[PDB]
């Protein structure tokens, strides 16, 4: 997939494209699927 191209991971997160979907890696301090929540 190419879902990571639109930078869906907020707050300094990094993104990996899977086949169906994507996943965010979030830095210490943020959580949620898009790193959109405070930890």
């Amino acid at each position: 997939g190419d879902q990571c191209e639109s930078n869906p991971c907020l707050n300094g997160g990094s993104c990996k494209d899977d086949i169906n979907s994507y996943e965010c890696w979030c830095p210490f301090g943020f959580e949620g699927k898009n790193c959109e929540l405070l930890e």
């Binding site: 639109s6 930078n7 869906p8 907020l10 707050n11 949620g32």
Partner: protein
């Protein structure tokens, strides 16, 4: 060579502007009619038969299910892009008090879901931000008008707050009038479509004509993603306004960049005519912007830039009209009233009684 090109372009401009009519009779657009042609055309395929429960159940796999029931908003627990759901919910929540019941399958992915070449299981209705004639998806104003656009260093929470951005760009357009803008083409964005390549390559060969460089996005996999050059830094939307000639390209689908460029009072060069957002129909080529066909050549860029560099008052007129259109007809009020008008017309299509579903979560208000 140069003369033939000039004649062709000036003919196209004269014709476009002679044929042009305003999107509403009055500029304030009290009845929210400016972009109404789009929502009518998007809902038209459902007019004769309406929307059945089966069509909704069948469409559910293509997006995030929202349900307005009893003036309360419900949703799938799992939103694929939570930050985009937040942007959408900003607009839905204020309307739920005065909206009848409905089920909405809202796709929050970049790419539309209902290919009109395929058929049957992909009959919809499904709502998506961007489409072409190849897709049956109903366009809605993107999340990013409030929240959840792409995240960058200058916008770590995602590009959003179009209300604030409008004021920021109005002020910056006032600070850098036409005559003080640099007479160069400008683009600073990532390689989300190879339609962007020839502009970047032209810039490398002729930096005095075009300043175009690839940034890196979160999907970066190899140096090929910047055509083997070091990744350039992000440039703010404000700083785009120092250039006279601003380029926009499709990305995965339509790009959120486009609307920002107009508010610089720069001349916008919009490449391709397929990928839409809901407001693109009333942006008219040669009236509000300079259209270029998909996959432009370096020679095409050289010709069109040379023409406008030599016809500077004409360039400023188009740029001014584009600015004015986005200023007057892409207000927050226009976004909010489009949402409302869309949903009110859609609900009339439903040929079934909306029932609660306990697995959905309560959103608000």
């Amino acid at each position: 060579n140069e003369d033939e090109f000039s004649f062709k372009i000036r003919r196209q401009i004269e014709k476009a502007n002679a044929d042009y009519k305003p999107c509403s009779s009055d500029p304030q657009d009290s009845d929210c009619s400016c972009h109404a042609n789009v929502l009518k055309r998007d809902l038209a395929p459902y007019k004769s038969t309406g929307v059945t429960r089966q069509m909704i159940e069948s469409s559910a796999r293509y997006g995030t299910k929202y349900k307005i029931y009893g003036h309360r908003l419900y949703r799938d627990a799992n939103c694929m892009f939570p930050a985009r759901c937040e942007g959408i919910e900003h607009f839905l929540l204020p309307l739920v008090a005065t909206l009848p019941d409905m089920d909405l399958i809202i796709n929050t992915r970049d790419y539309p879901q209902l290919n009109a070449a395929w058929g049957n299981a992909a009959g919809g209705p499904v709502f998506s931000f961007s489409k072409t004639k190849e897709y049956r998806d109903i366009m809605y104003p993107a999340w990013t008008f409030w929240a959840g656009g792409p995240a960058t260093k200058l916008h770590p929470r995602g590009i959003g707050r179009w209300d604030q951005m409008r004021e920021k760009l109005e002020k910056r357009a006032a600070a850098i009038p036409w005559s003080q803008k640099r007479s160069l083409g400008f683009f600073r964005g990532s390689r989300t479509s190879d339609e962007r390549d020839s502009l970047i390559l032209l810039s490398r060969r002729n930096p005095e004509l075009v300043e175009a460089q690839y940034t890196k996005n979160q999907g970066w996999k190899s140096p090929k993603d910047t055509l083997d050059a070091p990744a350039a830094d992000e440039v703010s939307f404000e700083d785009h306004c120092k250039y006279k000639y601003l380029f926009n390209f499709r990305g995965v689908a339509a790009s959120f960049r486009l609307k920002h460029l107009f508010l610089c009072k720069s001349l916008v060069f919009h490449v391709g005519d397929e990928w839409q957002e809901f407001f693109y129909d009333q942006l008219k080529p040669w009236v509000h912007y300079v259209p270029l066909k998909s996959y432009p050549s370096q020679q095409e860029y050289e010709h069109i830039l040379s023409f406008f560099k030599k016809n500077d008052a004409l360039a400023q007129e188009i740029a001014q009209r584009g600015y004015d259109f986005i200023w007057e007809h892409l207000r927050m009020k226009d976004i909010k009233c489009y949402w409302r008008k869309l949903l009110k017309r859609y609900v009339k299509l439903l040929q079934y009684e909306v029932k609660p579903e306990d697995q959905l979560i309560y959103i608000g208000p």
